[PDB]
DNA sequence: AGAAGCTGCACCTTCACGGC
């Protein structure tokens, strides 16, 4: 029932110190949970004034530059840290390792509400952009397009606003604006499929996803096995350690009016497609899935295949 | 009885490891180091020494280590949704951290 | 009564990374076709100039080591031989909503903190604080090592209103010193703009571009990256510089610490100079941490003496408290 | 009072990568658009000149001494055949404020070190140090192998004030020797200007040009690049000359080594000449390290006697210690 | 002459090698 009637395209945002740490097993690109939380914060700050809902968001990542370095002699890479000030007496404090990365990603998000008939044509998108300029995306300050040779505008396309040839024409003119990027997709049916082809009288713990992340150059009577697209591991939500507690129960929460729960990360498989083989741009959007008395605080891209 | 010599060997191993890297010549610290860390008052002080929790999936200490929060030993329930999986929980049994 | 157990404050006055281009002086008008300075890797040969540890060694191998050379490979950023001007450019977002805590447990503590910052901005708004921030934008303090040998430096600041410029400022950064905070007209206009962007009304975007007359072919300093050097030969190179989009730049936190050093109120000889605004006010240069909680002048004791025991500090120390509130941090018990 | 665990000193007397062009003598005045010397990669046929190893000591494989043209690949830098003058040009900032470290831990040690440097500079200023620096700038010691066979070497030093000269010196570099610091009126004026730049009383950026008559189409020697790559052959050049933008150049640390040779005070036989100033004063090309720690005349023991124990050394060792502080580096526990 | 908070000190503790 979460179906958009519009698609507000926010253009190629640049992000200067993101969270290159994504999860206790995965690093690199930030979590899609960050993008769903950014769109939910935008709906908390903008969308209630326009009586519109903002659910679902795409990711293109026009460029990525992590702040890492190769230790001179090893095959792995270490993170370029930051320097914290001294503690209380004059002494170098204990360093925590924060992974930071420069991102450049445009995102299209699905407008849902009754606050558009024909009056907010391109001022609703201007309002959303000029309010999201004063916000951060994954811990990274969105650099709001300084004085340069060109500007970069926003867009608002309606699915009912146009007939079928105009629907595919507007889809084509939308996907020309984000064509060098790479669309991120949750792929869970592919993970379960590769599991049940892997699971031939042998069990698993987490190797179903680690075997698709790696680059095996094994031999079969050297050869190397191929994977379709960049099948990466991504943190796809949380799972319940604890039964959820009342607001006046847990010491040192963020606030004493929300129930708190202790959660673990959950792990799934994502793909970086190009956005010219999506076959419907009304897909490719990241939604939440609570089921909150079970756990399973997941985010995904449903309705895909 | 049958395991007394095992714990006496471990206590003597800790005692020799303490006495080796002392760099001592004077002040006679070995008398106290053989009074405490050799006899069965070491087990009394070990039962006095607390702090352990024997975690499985919850270590608050990687998140900014000067943080006296709560740590859990509760492995989570299996997700009913087909697809994704985590927690090393459907086979190949795992060791328990202690904080 | 009791303070908030979780108390967070986001970074207002958020700058961006300060890209470095190179060009001739008096060509600052057409300073958009200027090429950027690229970091290079060069291998150097030097001596064993560090002091030795004559513990579990022998004298023959150590004096044979100090007789023998020492090969390293560092990173360096030079100006070209046709460019005696460094152009350091960055953007700066003044966010707005200064005293609002981004996380707070107790509703009573949140109400008392909001009333305290409300009475502060009612009786003494962001005049002196924004004047000190406008000084530290106006004198080129974000050139850390790039300022000490400059003949002349000039700071151009442009307010970007919608998608284009609205106000242009042009300052001489050597007349405005690094230790004094005078009162001029254009500095007060920039401070009023910063205060309007800090009073919750707007989220002001400025561009700052600083021209520095260093010399032909001289060496500039982008901010050095921190690698902890605990492992297999990850410290053989000993110097790595920061590079974004194939261009040398300074980190965001270094520019923030550079325009943040406004505090001329600490109990240890405040005629020395302004230091960075930190809780238990620390300088990493002298290796000291001023305002220790043995004296009653740290940020924490001044904070829960202001908003909890209802006793206001001196007029200069509540400026420091609100400067920590703009600075942002994680506090609470 | 003890030595701080981190002590970093920033480079005063900062040179640039000295570029090399080639032209004709008596056209030294209009030597602005002189064509640059390029590095040419050539392949040479040679012989086996190295002494034989124990594996090549076989009677069958001493054929490598007999027929093996040895086929090496080197770089070269030559003048044009109608051009008998090498011009080497660079710039040099001298900053000042020598005794202030850019990183410290003990503020008491920092204050004691600033007190010792202050009582030095008000006891005896930078007169002997800047005199020896101006003498090493006078004779073209930065022309390292480009000086040993040159017929006449002439240097021109221009005090670039804003974009033009403010005072120009012109020295015959061969008349001023490489082993004794004599006196001259223009040399005392340049020494006083370098001393005024060394005390923070002015901004001093000099442009140093040096012409040398090597010969018509002879070979000039730029800096050779260090390639930190170990054992491999048949494709390794083992001689890579340094060049910036297809123009042969000398390294900046090479010039910094050459105008630092002011140390005529070391407890060994000083009848040879000045060596460079390093802690445990080393010439690794000669294989000997003067001021060994078995003598009490290295930089660290003299420094920790001057600062910690208040045992002031002789005035020459004071000049050596302050020359090391002008050099810079990492000192500390 | 008894209560709270601060500081000083002790206690724990080392690796396996060559680009879809």
A67 part of contact set with chain C, CB < 8 Å: yes
Interchain proximity D227–C43, CB inside 8 Å: yes
Question: Hey, what are A215's tokens?
Answer: 């680059």
- Going by their DSSP bridges, the two strands D85-94 and D204-212 should be labelled as antiparallel
Nearest CA in chain C to D287: C67
Determine the distance in angstroms separating the CA of A74 from the nearest CA of chain C, rounded to an integer: 7
Interchain contact, A146 vs C160, CB within 8 Å: yes
d(CA A257, CA C95): 27
Residue from C171, C105, D36 nearest A249 by CA = C105
When scoring B62, B85, B89, B90 by the number of chain A Cβ atoms within 10 A, the one with the most, hence best to mutate, is: B85
Interchain CB contact of A236 with B (< 8 Å):
yes
- Given resolution (angstroms): 3.4
Q: Does B51 touch chain A (CB under 8 A)?
A: no
The Cβ of residue D52 has, within 10 Å, a number of other Cβ atoms equal to 13
Q: Which of D251, D281, D285 is nearest to D263 (CA)?
A: D281
Interchain CB distance below 8 Å, C219 and D282: no
Protein CA A92 to sugar C1' E14 (Å): 23
A75 touches strand E (CB under 7 A): yes
Q: Which residue of B has its CA nearest to A206?
A: B88
Considering all nucleic acid strands, name the nucleotide whose C1' atom is nearest to the C-alpha of residue B21.
E13
Distances (CA, A) of C118 to A206, A285, C202, D224: 53, 42, 18, 66
Taking an 8 Å cut-off on Cβ atoms, the answer to whether B77 and A189 are in contact is no
Contact predicate D252/D239, CB 8 Å: no
Kindly list the residues from chain C whose CB atom is less than 8 angstroms away from the CB atom of residue D102. Answer: 285
Neighbours of D319 (CB within 10 A): 23
Tokens of C29: 């008008």
The β-bridge partners of C210 are C88, C155
Residues 3-62 (B) near nucleic chain E, CB < 7 A: 14, 18
Separation between Cα atoms, residue D322 and residue C21, nearest integer Å:
35
Asked if D193 and D167 count as a contact pair (C-beta separation under 8 A), the reply is yes
Q: How many contacts (CB atoms, under 8 Å) link C and D?
A: 111
List CB contacts of B4: < 8 A, sequence separation 6 or more.
Answer: none
From the CA of C332 to the C1' of E4: give the distance in Å: 21
C-alpha–C-alpha distance, residues A174 and A10, integer Å? 11
- Most A-contacting residue of C92, C225, C249, C266 (CB-CB within 10 A), to test interface: C225
CA of A215 to C1' of E20 (A): 10
B91: closest CA of chain A, how far (Å): 5
Both tokens of C134, joined, read 């406008």
Count of other CB atoms within 10 angstroms of residue A211: 15
Any idea which residue has 């929300």 for tokens?
A: A258
Rounded (5°) CA angle D201-D203-D206: 130
Residue whose C-alpha is closest to residue C257's, from C15, C9, C10: C15
Distance of CA C328 to the CA centre of its chain: 14
Residue written as token pair 């005035």: D315
Contact indicator for D39, D103 with CB cutoff of 8 Å: no
Which structure tokens are listed for D121?
């500079």
Cα dihedral D176, D178, D182, D183 sign: positive
- Nearest-Cα distance to chain B for A268, in Å, is 5
Q: What is the spatial distance, in angstroms and rounded to an integer, between the CA atom of B17 and the C1' atom of E12?
A: 13
Hey, what are D18's tokens? 């000295």
**Burial (CB count within 10 angstroms: exposed 0-12, middle 13-18, buried 19+), residue C282:** buried
What string of DSSP letters covers A197-266? HH-SS---SSHHHHHHHS-------------SS-EEEEEEEEEESS--B-TTTSSS-S-SSS-B--EEEE
DSSP string, D31-88: -SSPPBPPPEEEEE-----SPP-SSTTSSSTTHHHHS----EEEEE-B--TT--EEEE
Q: Whole-angstrom Cα distance, residue A179 to residue A177?
A: 6
**Planar angle of CA B71, B75, B76, nearest 5 degrees:** 110
CA of A241 to C1' of E20 (A): 41
Reduced to 3 states (helix: H, G, I; strand: E, B; else coil), residue C119 is helix
Closest chain A residue by Cα to residue C200 = A134
Q: Which of C215, A55, C293, C149 is nearest to D91 (CA)?
A: C215
Question: Which nucleotide lies nearest residue B49, CA to C1'?
Answer: E11
Short-list D95, D98, D100, D120, CA closest to D110: D100
Give CA–CA dist C51/C39, Å, rounded.
Answer: 30
β-partners of residue A107 are A10
Q: What distance in Å separates the CA atoms of residue A271 and residue A184, rounded to the nearest whole number? A: 6
For strand E, is any atom closer than 7 Å to the CB of C35?
Answer: no
Inter-chain residue contact C215 with D280, CB threshold 8 Å: no
DSSP, collapsed to helix, strand or coil, labels residue D125 as: coil
Q: Do D294 and C63 touch (CB under 8 A)?
A: yes
Query: What is d(CA D330, CA D333) in angstroms, rounded to the nearest whole number?
Result: 10
Question: Which residues contact residue A18 at a Cβ distance below 8 angstroms, ignoring those fewer than 6 apart?
Answer: A30, A100, A101, A102, A103, A137, A138, A139, A140
Cβ–Cβ < 8 Å for C225, A67:
yes
| Residue A91 Cα distances to C292, D38, D141, angstroms | 13, 51, 44
Contacts of C119 (CB under 8 A, 6+ apart): none
Structure-derived torsion over alpha carbons of residues A59, A63, A68, A72, reported in degrees to the nearest 10: 130
Strand pairing class (C14-15; C7-9): unpaired
- DSSP letter at D225? P
Q: Both tokens of residue C190?
A: 């920039």
The whole-angstrom separation of Cα C82 and Cα A45 is 50
Does residue C293 approach strand E to less than 7 Å at its CB?
Answer: yes
Write out the E strands in D173-264: 204-212, 249-250
Cα–Cα distance, A128 to A54 (Å, whole number): 11
Experimentally determined by? cryo-EM
Candidates A203, A267, A269; nearest CB to B86: A267
Tokens representing A65 are 């530059």
Q: With an 8 Å Cβ cutoff, are C81 and D244 in contact? A: yes
Q: Rounded distance, CA D124 to CA C96, Å?
A: 55
H-state helical runs in chain D: 63-66, 107-121, 127-138, 185-198, 252-258, 299-306, 315-327
Residue at the smallest CA–C1' distance to nucleotide E5 = C294
Asked if residues D45 and D51 have their Cβ atoms less than 8 Å apart, the reply is: no
* Beta strands C247-250; C243-244: pairing state: antiparallel
How many angstroms separate the CA atoms of C179 and C135, rounded? 10
Q: How far apart are CA D25 and CA D151, in angstroms?
A: 11
Is the CB of A91 within 7 Å of strand E?
A: no
Of the candidates A163, A179, A141, the residue with the CA atom closest to the CA atom of residue A275? A179
Place of tokens 């007789």: C67
CA–CA distance from C30 to each of C87, C140, C220, D275 (Å)? 12, 21, 21, 47
- Token readout for C301 is 């004791």
Let me know if A141 is exposed, middle or buried by CB neighbors in 10 A (0-12, 13-18, 19+): buried
Q: Is B31 on the interface with A (CB under 8 A)?
A: no
Interchain proximity A239–B88, CB inside 8 Å: no
Q: Which residue is nearest to nucleotide E20 (CA to C1')?
A: A224
* DSSP string across C166-235: EEEEEEETTTS-SS-----HHHHHHHHHHHHHHTTS--EEEEEEEEEE--TT-EE-PPBPB----SSSTT
Asked if B88 lies within 8 A of A206 by C-beta distance, the reply is yes
Nearest to C66 by CA among D4, D294, D152, A65: D294
Is residue B92 a contact partner of residue A205, using CB atoms and an 8 Å limit?
yes
Contact A86 C104 (CB under 8 A): no
Q: CB of A191 within 8 A of CB of A268?
A: yes
- A269 and B CB contact within 8 Å: yes
> Does strand E come within 7 Å of the CB of A73?
no
**Contact criterion met (CB below 8 Å) for A86 and C282:** yes
Concatenated DSSP letters of C65-93:
HHHS-EEEEEEEEE--TT--EEEEEEEEE
| Interface membership of C294 toward A (CB under 8 Å) | no
DSSP codes, A129-164: HHHHTTSBSSS-BEE---S-S-----EEEESSSS-H
Name the residue of chain C whose CA is nearest to A83's CA: C226
Radius of gyration of chain B (CA): 21
Give the nucleotide with minimal C1' distance to the Cα of A73: E17
Structure tokens at C41: 């890797």
**Tokens found for residue A275:** 């956005």
Rounded distance, CA D96 to CA D99, Å?
9
Of D14, D160, D278, the CB nearest to C219: D14
| Distance from C-alpha of A226 to C-alpha of A214, rounded to nearest angstrom | 10
- Given a contact cutoff of 8 angstroms between Cβ atoms, the answer to whether C24 and C82 are in contact is yes
Distance of CA D75 to CAs A204, D17, D23, D45, Å? 60, 19, 21, 13
User: Are residues A301 and A285 in contact, defined by beta-carbon separation less than 8 angstroms?
Assistant: yes
D139: how many CB neighbours lie within 10 A of its CB?
22
Residue C317, SS3 per DSSP: helix
Tell me the chain A residues in contact with residue B88 when contact means C-beta distances shorter than 8 Å.
205-206
Q: Determine the nucleotide nearest to C294 by Cα–C1' distance.
A: E6
d(CA D237, CA D71): 10
d(CA D290, CA D302): 14
Residue among A125, A119, A159 nearest A5 (CA): A159
Min Cα–Cα distance to chain B from A112, Å: 27
CA distance D177 to D136: 9
Q: Is A241–B74 a contact, with Cβ atoms under 8 angstroms apart?
A: yes
């Amino acid at each position: 029932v979460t179906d958009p009637e519009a698609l507000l395209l926010l253009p190629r945002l640049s992000i200067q110190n993101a969270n290159a740490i994504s999860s206790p097993l995965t690093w690199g690109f930030p979590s899609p949970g960050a993008f769903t939380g950014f769109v939910h914060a935008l709906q908390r700050r903008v969308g209630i004034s326009l009586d519109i809902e903002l659910d679902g968001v795409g990711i293109v990542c026009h460029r990525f530059e992590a702040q890492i370095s190769q230790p001179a002699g090893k095959r792995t890479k270490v993170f370029n840290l930051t320097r914290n000030p001294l503690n209380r007496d004059g002494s170098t404090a204990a360093i925590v390792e924060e992974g930071r990365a420069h991102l450049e990603v445009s995102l299209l998000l699905g407008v849902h509400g009754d606050g558009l008939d024909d009056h907010p044509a391109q001022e609703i998108a201007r309002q959303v952009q000029e309010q999201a300029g004063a916000m951060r995306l994954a811990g990274g300050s969105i650099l709001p397009w300084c004085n340069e040779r060109f500007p970069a505008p926003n867009a608002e396309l309606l699915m009912l606003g146009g007939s079928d040839e105009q629907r595919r024409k507007n889809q084509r003119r939308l996907t020309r604006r984000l064509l060098p990027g790479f669309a991120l997709v949750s792929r869970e049916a592919l993970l379960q499929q590769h599991l049940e082809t892997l699971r031939t009288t042998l069990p698993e713990a987490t190797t179903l996803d680690a075997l698709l992340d790696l680059c095996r150059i094994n031999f079969e009577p050297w050869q190397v096995r191929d994977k379709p697209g960049w099948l990466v591991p991504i943190p796809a939500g949380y799972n319940a350690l604890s039964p959820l507690y009342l607001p006046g129960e847990v010491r040192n929460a963020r606030d004493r009016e929300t129930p708190l729960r202790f959660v673990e990360n959950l792990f799934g498989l994502g793909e970086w497609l190009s956005p010219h083989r999506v076959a419907a741009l009304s897909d490719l959007l990241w939604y939440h899935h609570a089921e909150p008395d079970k756990g399973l605080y997941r985010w995904s891209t449903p309705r895909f295949v | 009885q049958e395991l007394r010599q095992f714990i006496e060997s471990f206590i003597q191993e800790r005692l020799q490891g303490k006495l080796d890297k002392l760099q001592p010549d004077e002040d006679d610290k070995r008398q106290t180091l053989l009074a405490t860390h050799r006899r069965e008052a070491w087990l009394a002080d070990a039962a006095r020494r607390v702090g352990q929790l024997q975690l499985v999936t919850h270590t608050l200490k990687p998140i900014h280590p000067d943080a006296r929060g709560s740590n859990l030993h509760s492995l989570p329930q299996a997700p009913g949704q087909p697809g994704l999986a985590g927690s090393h929980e459907l086979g190949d049994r795992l060791v328990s951290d202690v904080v | 009564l009791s303070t908030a157990s979780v108390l967070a404050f986001e970074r207002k006055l958020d700058p961006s990374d300060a890209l470095m281009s190179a060009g001739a002086w008096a060509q600052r008008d057409a300073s958009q076709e200027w090429p950027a300075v690229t970091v290079r890797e060069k291998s150097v040969r030097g001596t064993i100039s560090n002091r030795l540890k004559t513990k579990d060694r022998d004298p023959a191998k150590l004096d044979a080591s100090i007789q023998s050379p020492n090969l390293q490979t560092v990173d360096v950023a030079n100006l070209p031989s046709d460019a005696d001007t460094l152009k350091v450019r960055f953007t700066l977002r003044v966010l707005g909503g200064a005293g609002t805590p981004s996380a707070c447990n107790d509703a009573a503590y949140r109400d008392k903190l909001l009333q305290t910052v409300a009475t502060y901005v009612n009786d003494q708004g962001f005049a002196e604080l924004a004047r000190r921030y406008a000084h530290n934008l106006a004198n080129a303090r974000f050139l850390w090592r790039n300022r000490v040998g400059a003949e002349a430096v000039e700071v151009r600041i442009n307010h970007i209103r919608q998608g284009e410029v609205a106000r242009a400022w042009r300052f001489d950064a050597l007349a405005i010193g690094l230790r004094d905070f005078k009162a001029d007209a254009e500095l007060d206009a920039l401070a009023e703009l910063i205060a309007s962007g800090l009073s919750g009304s707007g989220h002001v975007l400025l561009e700052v571009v600083a021209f520095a007359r260093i010399g032909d072919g001289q060496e500039v300093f982008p901010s050095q990256e921190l690698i902890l050097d605990k492992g297999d030969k990850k410290g053989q190179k000993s110097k790595t510089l920061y590079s974004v989009r194939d261009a040398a730049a300074i980190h965001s936190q270094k520019i923030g610490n550079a325009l943040r050093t406004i505090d001329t109120w600490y109990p240890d000889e405040d005629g020395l100079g302004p230091i960075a605004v930190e809780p238990y006010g620390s300088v990493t240069s002298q290796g000291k941490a001023y305002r220790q909680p043995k004296q009653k002048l740290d940020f924490y004791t001044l904070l829960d003496n202001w908003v909890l025991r209802d006793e206001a500090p001196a007029v200069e120390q509540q400026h420091y408290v609100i400067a920590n509130l703009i600075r942002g941090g994680v506090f609470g018990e």
